[PDB]
Design a protein around this ligand. Structure first.
Ligand SMILES: Cc1cn([C@H]2C[C@H](O)[C@@H](COP(=O)(O)OP(=O)(O)OP(=O)(O)O)O2)c(=O)[nH]c1=O
Ligand SMILES: [Mg+2]
Ligand SMILES: [Mg+2]
Ligand SMILES: [Mg+2]
Ligand code: NA
Length: 383
DNA sequence: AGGACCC
DNA sequence: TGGGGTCCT
C-alpha cells in the first residue's frame, strides 16, 4: 500500500498569466502589483533582485526599468487555475488544490494500470523522466523505484499537456507522500521536475535550514519552537514527545513531529468546486464611513456575478473588517448571518446591502468615529 | 467568531 | 494599506 503522489507547481503564476495576455511583456522584467506591493514577478525580474512581497519603491530602486501590472482583480488568475486543475483531473479524478497554483494528484492507480500493461522484457526499458533527487541510482529490480519512475513519466505528460493546451510552464515532484512530493518539486526550477527515491528521504528532509520550511509549520508554531531551543529538523526529530505535546497539544505536536521524519499519511482529497467565494479591499485607514457602504456594494456586485456563474447557492453571508493601529491588535473581526430564503436565487443588491449594513453596524460604533483598513465579504455554505 | 495553516 | 483559500476549535 505505497503511494505515488505528484505535486504540480506553476512558476510565477500571475506573471505567467500576464505574459500570456500581453506578450510584449515576455522579455521585459515584470512584477504584478497589488496596492503598494509586488506580489510576484517573472524570472527576469528575479535576476534583477526583485522578490515576492517587496514594496513598489524598493523594487524600482533595484530595477528601475521594472514594468508593473495591477493584479488586484483575481478573475483571470482564478480562471486559469481551474483550467489547470481540470486538465489534471483528466489524468486521475482525485486532484487536491493548494492556493491557485499548486495541485496534488494521487497517481497510484494509474501507475498500477500502466505496470499491468507491460510484460517482463520492457520492465527494464522503463526510464526516468526529469531529475532524480540527489542523483541517486535507480535499481530496476526495486518495485518502489519502478513505480516512482512511471510516476515521473506521468508527471512529464502532465507538464507537456499543460504547456500544449494552456501555455503554462511548471515544476513537478514525484514521491511517496504529499509532504515529500511538495519538498521535492522545488529542487530544480523553473520548469523542471524531480523524483524522490525512498533512500534519499532523510537527505531531502535534512537539506532544510529552518523548521518553518516544513509545510504545516507556520508563523505561530515556528516561533513557539524556536523559543524551546528547536531550530533544525533534527532538533525536532529528537525532541521530547512529552514536552512538545504539552507545549502544542497531542494533535499539533504529534503531527509536526511525524512530518519532521518525512512521514505524512494524509490522503489526497478531491477539492471539487470551492467551499466559499470572497472579495477584499485594503486601504490606509481610508474608510470612516458611509464610504464603507459604497465599498461594500462594489465587492457585492462582483461576487453576485461569480455566485451566479457557479449556480449553486450560498446560504450564509459574512462581513469581515480590520481596525487602525498598527503593529498592535491586527487580528480581524467578522459577523455572519444566514441569507433569507426569499433572497436565495434583480433586484438582489438592495436587500443584500442592508443585511451587510446591519452586520457592519453590529461591529462598528458608528457614533464615535471609526478606524477601518479592510472590508471583506464572503459567501459560503452552499448547495 | 476566531484561529491555524497554505499559496 | 496583497487577495485570496482550507479546515479546526
Ligand atoms: C505564497 C504566496 C503566493 N501568492 C500568489 C503569488 C503567486 O503567483 C501564487 C503562487 O505563489 P508561489 O507558488 O509561492 O510562487 P509563484 O507561483 O508566484 O512563483 P514560483 O512558484 O515560480 O516561485 O500565489 C500570494 O499572493 N501570496 C503569497 O503569500
Ligand atoms: Mg508556484
Ligand atoms: Mg490550484
Ligand atoms: Mg511552513
Ligand atoms: Na523527474
Amino acid at each position: 500500500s505505497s503511494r505515488v503522489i505528484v505535486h504540480v507547481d506553476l512558476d510565477c503564476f500571475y506573471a505567467q498569466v500576464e505574459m500570456i495576455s500581453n506578450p510584449e511583456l515576455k522579455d521585459k522584467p515584470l512584477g504584478v502589483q497589488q496596492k503598494y506591493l509586488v506580489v510576484t514577478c517573472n524570472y527576469e525580474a528575479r535576476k534583477l533582485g526583485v522578490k515576492k512581497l517587496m514594496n513598489v519603491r524598493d523594487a524600482k530602486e533595484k530595477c528601475p526599468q521594472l514594468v508593473l501590472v495591477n493584479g488586484e482583480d483575481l478573475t483571470r488568475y482564478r480562471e486559469m487555475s481551474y483550467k489547470v486543475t481540470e486538465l489534471l483531473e483528466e489524468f486521475s479524478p482525485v486532484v487536491e488544490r493548494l492556493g491557485f497554483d499548486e495541485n496534488f494528484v494521487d497517481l497510484t492507480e494509474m501507475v498500477e494500470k500502466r505496470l499491468q500493461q507491460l510484460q517482463s522484457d520492457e520492465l527494464s526499458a522503463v526510464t526516468v523522466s526529469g531529475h532524480v533527487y540527489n542523483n541517486q541510482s535507480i535499481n530496476l529490480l526495486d518495485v518502489l523505484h519502478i513505480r516512482l519512475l512511471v510516476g515521473s513519466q506521468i508527471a512529464a505528460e502532465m507538464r507537456e499537456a499543460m504547456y500544449n493546451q494552456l501555455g503554462l510552464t511548471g515544476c513537478a515532484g514525484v514521491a511517496s507522500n504529499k509532504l515529500l512530493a511538495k519538498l521535492v518539486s522545488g529542487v530544480f526550477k523553473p520548469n523542471q521536475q524531480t523524483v524522490l527515491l525512498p533512500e534519499s528521504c532523510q537527505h531531502l528532509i535534512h537539506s532544510l535550514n529552518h523548521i518553518k520550511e516544513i509545510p504545516g509549520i507556520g508563523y505561530k508554531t515556528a516561533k513557539c519552537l524556536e523559543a524551546l531551543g528547536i531550530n533544525s529538523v533534527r532538533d525536532l526529530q529528537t525532541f521530547s514527545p512529552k514536552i512538545l505535546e504539552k507545549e502544542l497539544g497531542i494533535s499539533v505536536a504529534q503531527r509536526i513531529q511525524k512530518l519532521s521524519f518525512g512521514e505524512d499519511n494524509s490522503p489526497v482529497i478531491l477539492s471539487g468546486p470551492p467551499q466559499s467565494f470572497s472579495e477584499e479591499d485594503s486601504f490606509k485607514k481610508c474608510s470612516s464611513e458611509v464610504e464603507a457602504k459604497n465599498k461594500i456594494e462594489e465587492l457585492l456586485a462582483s461576487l453576485l456575478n461569480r455566485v451566479c456563474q457557479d449556480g449553486r447557492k450560498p446560504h450564509t453571508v459574512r462581513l469581515i473588517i480590520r481596525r487602525y493601529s498598527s503593529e498592535k491588535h491586527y487580528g480581524r473581526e467578522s459577523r455572519q448571518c444566514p441569507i433569507p430564503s426569499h433572497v436565495i436565487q434583480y433586484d438582489v443588491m438592495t436587500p443584500m446591502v442592508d443585511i451587510l449594513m446591519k452586520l457592519f453596524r453590529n461591529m462598528v460604533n458608528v457614533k464615535m468615529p471609526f478606524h477601518l483598513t479592510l472590508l471583506s465579504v464572503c459567501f459560503c455554505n452552499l448547495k
